[PDB]
Symmetry: C3
Subunit: 131 residues, 3 copies
């Protein structure tokens, strides 16, 4: 199997300051993604592509795609008074064996990450080129 | 030739309960996506990645990415009182010959999927790893 | 090294009528993407996948993914008075040596493309199948 996964969130407002535990799996080649931690751990060295889609409601939402402690990409969305919204992101990253990639909200002031049984926020990633 | 495509919807408000027929093709290697059905049919077994972007206007829009008869991912957006909006999604799926992947709205109560000549709603997909 | 890149914008309102210069690079295999121009120039012939995420604030945003001088895909978003929003696009394109792919806003009437140190609008692309 090649490293590739897609995980969905089905409960709104996950913890701030910790990897978002997307736990509904569609695929998880090589099991490099852990639904119990929300972290993708690099086993195969190379270039990867990650994508994420997060809904917003009740409050602003600020997320960052992390590679270990480093924020690689930031996505911010301001809640639209009374309505559900969404913001997305994607990025190509060169990963070293052991690198841990995940999505996380850095601020308690922007924790409006929404999700539901029929409204999936998600996180996907897969190997492009082995290095 | 490898299976890969991008289809854009140029006409607003497609029927509910049936695959959304994105009509305009930018690419369609192996022609596994059919504009007449809105369905991507797996010919080459393997891991695939799909991405979609749907505009919302005039009403709420609830769509799901299906694999055969199973809803794999749900995307929802609420119409912003007189303002065009958009919601997206993407997913990695292991497919076998004959499997069908498409987007479909399950309810008449949220069928505001919008599209226009200069406002493209889209659906893309491609083979990642042959299995 | 394979062709693949992700470039982020960290300053708002890039000029209309010219490629958007995403200059914060996460990866740039073969350096086929130029931070100084915002243009990806094809070196290796083949099928590519491009994805972009653009925030909207203060004004509507109308951007197009160009291949040379032809608009391949259009993405539009109506600014939600007072709040930051976002719209995205994805496209599979068959490229020949020398082909240039970039994002550009055609009208001054919809140039509200936003970005900041805390929110990245971005442009990514990579080779799927060499031809
Ligand atoms: C940590 C940095 C300041 C320090 C840093 O940028 N130093 C530069 C070089 C060292 C400051 C500068 C602007 C701040 C953001 C905005 O307020 C918008 C939004 C408001 C929400 O309520 C919470 C989330 C968010 C994205 C805020 C986050 C964080 O608080 C920021 C990035």
């Amino acid at each position: 199997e090649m490293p590739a996964f897609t995980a969905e969130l089905t409960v709104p407002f996950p913890p701030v300051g910790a990897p978002v535990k997307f736990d509904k799996l569609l695929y998880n080649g090589r099991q490099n993604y852990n639904p119990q931690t929300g972290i993708f751990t690099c086993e195969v060295p190379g270039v990867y592509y990650f994508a994420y889609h997060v809904h917003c409601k009740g409050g602003n939402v600020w997320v960052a795609l992390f590679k270990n402690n480093e924020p690689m990409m930031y996505t911010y969305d301001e809640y639209k008074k009374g309505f559900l919204d969404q913001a997305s992101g994607s990025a190509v990253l060169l990963l070293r064996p052991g690198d841990q990639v995940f999505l996380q909200m850095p601020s308690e002031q922007a924790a409006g990450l929404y999700a539901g049984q029929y409204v999936h926020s998600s996180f996907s990633g897969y190997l492009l080129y082995p290095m």
